[PDB]
Design a protein around this ligand. Sequence first.
Ligand SMILES: [Mg+2]
Ligand SMILES: [Mg+2]
Ligand SMILES: [Mg+2]
Ligand SMILES: [Mg+2]
Ligand SMILES: [Mg+2]
Ligand SMILES: [Mg+2]
Ligand SMILES: [Mg+2]
Ligand SMILES: [Mg+2]
Ligand SMILES: [Mg+2]
Lengths: 168, 168, 173, 173, 168, 173
Amino acid sequence: SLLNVPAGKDLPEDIYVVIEIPANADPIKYEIDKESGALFVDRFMSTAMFYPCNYGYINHTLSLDGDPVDVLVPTPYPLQPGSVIRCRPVGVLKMTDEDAKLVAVPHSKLSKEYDHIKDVNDLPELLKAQIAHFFEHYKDLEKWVKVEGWENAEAAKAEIVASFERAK
Amino acid sequence: SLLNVPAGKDLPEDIYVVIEIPANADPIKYEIDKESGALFVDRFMSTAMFYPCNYGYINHTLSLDGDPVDVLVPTPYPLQPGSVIRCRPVGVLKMTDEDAKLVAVPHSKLSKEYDHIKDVNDLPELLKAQIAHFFEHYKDLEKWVKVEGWENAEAAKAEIVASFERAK
Amino acid sequence: SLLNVPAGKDLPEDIYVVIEIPANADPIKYEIDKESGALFVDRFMSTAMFYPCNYGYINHTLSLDGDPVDVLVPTPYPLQPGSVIRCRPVGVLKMTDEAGEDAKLVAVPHSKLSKEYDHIKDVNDLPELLKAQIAHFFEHYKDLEKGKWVKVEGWENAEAAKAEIVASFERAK
Amino acid sequence: SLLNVPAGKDLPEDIYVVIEIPANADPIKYEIDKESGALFVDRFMSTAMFYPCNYGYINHTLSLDGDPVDVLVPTPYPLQPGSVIRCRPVGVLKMTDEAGEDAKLVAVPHSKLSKEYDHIKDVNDLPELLKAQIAHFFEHYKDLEKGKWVKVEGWENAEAAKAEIVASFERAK
Amino acid sequence: SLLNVPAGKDLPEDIYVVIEIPANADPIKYEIDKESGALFVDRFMSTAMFYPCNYGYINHTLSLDGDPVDVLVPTPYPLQPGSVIRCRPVGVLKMTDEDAKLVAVPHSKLSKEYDHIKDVNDLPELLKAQIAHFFEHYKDLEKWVKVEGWENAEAAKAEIVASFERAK
Amino acid sequence: SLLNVPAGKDLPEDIYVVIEIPANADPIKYEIDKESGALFVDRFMSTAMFYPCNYGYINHTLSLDGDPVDVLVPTPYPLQPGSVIRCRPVGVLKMTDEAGEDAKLVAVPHSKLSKEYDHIKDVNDLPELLKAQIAHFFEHYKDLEKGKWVKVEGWENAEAAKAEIVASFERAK
Ligand SMILES: [Mg+2]
Ligand SMILES: [Mg+2]
Ligand SMILES: [Mg+2]
Ligand SMILES: [Mg+2]
Ligand SMILES: [Mg+2]
Ligand SMILES: [Mg+2]
Ligand SMILES: [Mg+2]
Ligand SMILES: [Mg+2]
Ligand SMILES: [Mg+2]
């Protein structure tokens, strides 16, 4: 089951992200039920918006807000909900609703299209702008958010370590 | 696994439906293998028809025909096969092939678009007509069905209780 | 060609809307080129949003913004860009952008194409959620565009909508 | 424009079919408007069915029902509404509806677009399942329409199909 | 879980194939992680090619190359990744990278559209040509393959028996 | 009609490309018929491949192969066949097939439709992977066609691309 997926091959550099929401999909917010490991429908988003990246989490992590570390992962093609992808963290969007969303890109073994993206600054400015705007507005018709800013790979990695250790 | 999903938060008012067939999809009839909990292909439908609603069942229920209680769940967007959705029952299409198909709509927490639908009579007449016609004709090129009529929330709820208790 | 499509069967009650952008599609803003009648890519939207309804225009109309009357049309399923749909107007979303005033009509499929909308006779009959999504979209789809802004001002009834159609049709003559 | 598309390269063996509805699509019945050549939404089908094949017509043909010859064309993948495909006729589904008689031709992609259909020379070569689905669809797609009914009467060969094409082409002159 | 799916109802005649890659899909190569049974992203294919058939494996089999027996399964419609389909083997494409890919078609109970295909020779020549060409070229932009030839149902069945027994 | 679409706003820097085949689509090779302007199905590709980019042409151009200049255009999302996109050329893939010489231009969306490509000024700025996929595709998409072969010869810069456009435009006059 998805419940048995490890946090990564080598934390915080090499991680696995369990995808819950594909990039560019219908506005259905799914979530893996932590008890069953099954894909539950969390809610039908009320805004006409879509996640600009595949969205999911790192298993075996516990942040402050209670859940696992949530990650956005850009890919050439939308991924299947419930699928697991190997990535390396490169940044973190910090916001207040405080919450942190990491940005991880596919591991070199899955694709070479991202090798050049080592840090938050290497991410296409538009994409960063879209992620922010999305997080800043998807819940408008409901819960609110306030994007504070981006942080580097180090801070993204620190969040992973802290949450994994905190999960233990 | 899907095998561990509960019948609902509060039977028969608040239930979880394990989706096997998405609304408006290619004519592939999937079914969750009860032993493995895996999605098996039951058959490739022979008619050029598609389920007008997402189709699935309530876990931990056993009707007479042997299976779990089967449910149709309208949603704004097609759901993923194997996904689980929280709903509240509102009616039942009774037919003879006797079989009963409940109609459940998304729980208020997932969407407010259905709050006004409390009973079978609140369902759009077209949709009810489509569900009937579909059930009445999808197996024409194979097994036959004869739609007898709709029943209220109470009867739909009674079917859930009877099947859950019968499952115990 | 799309350029020859009439404004409607009986304006302003019965109109045709030329679809340029389907509902729930990828963020590509298409626009029918006025001279060729061909579907041009106006731009790739910068926000992660999608039109909540099919969006197009009534041909042979000229609003004061120099363009045809814009119309949003909800349909059970997304339509093909470049297709024409028979509708009857039911409301208008009034707004102000960086250029000035703008209005978007909301029209529903005519009774002969579908009965599902027969009960929607006016702006008030539209699901509140739908109205909310349309407003939120227009209010935010251009947020990532330097120098562009939208201020939704409110909705207006069928009568106001029909008024826009006649004025613009006459104005286009 | 689609209005200028020829009936075919060499009628009735080699024809072009203007596609209006793709195979396995959402239940939206499109129709090319005869005067504009534009794709109009004829209606949103009320049943949970979809055309088992791409459906369109041969341009410049006039059958006695006042419309062009209707043709169903199976293809490996669904075609774009408004596209034209070169086919060769292989059969005709004869039926009677509430208005009277109707016939739908079944044509397959010409050998130059694909070799996959070279072995389908006549109505009997079509997979029985495909023939069954087409009949069932026409027999049931209008079930939720008050006052509409279809009674499939049977299939006919390539020769009968080609006969329909020539008669209607000549008839359209 | 998918890990508990049996090899088939009756080996080597009646088997179950666990689908990992749907036919005609985006070039994402998924694979079921053998430890968790979860769908992992193996890699984003670099060529602009797509599997001409649904691709997966027979569970509880171990070939030489180490994995389970991999199967291509033509269907009227693309199948869901992680879904299981009942088929009967009809041929095997042998190649060297040595590797063997079986071709199985849906079991008669799921569809009758394939009853007439009993052996490798009954498969549409184009499809066989497409499978070969695909296998011969998908890894060009990376690992190489050399299609050697097709073999009959018997050889396909022999491969299943050998791998199942070898898996024990 | 598509036949009336101009070659561009300011050739060879600013051009329009009429899309015939979208990126990452089913293997159906569409082609705009030169006389009708309608989208014809040229053929169903025999290989399990798909165009890595949207593919079309610049109207009003005539290369020595007797056809308009072919252009591949990467876009964030696949475009509708028959739509026109404003681009600026950045390179050309030179190749030789069974008929002789051929060249495919690579153009990117103009700055006004999207800023995402502003940094792509020349063939060298294109992602190497993209260049590799395009070459591999043209080199293999016709492998299952008896008597057809492609030999990619190399890439050339913006200048060479712009040269192709002017020569062909002038040549089409
Ligand atoms: Mg959090
Ligand atoms: Mg039952
Ligand atoms: Mg979308
Ligand atoms: Mg305006
Ligand atoms: Mg469908
Ligand atoms: Mg007729
Ligand atoms: Mg192997
Ligand atoms: Mg594809
Ligand atoms: Mg050329």
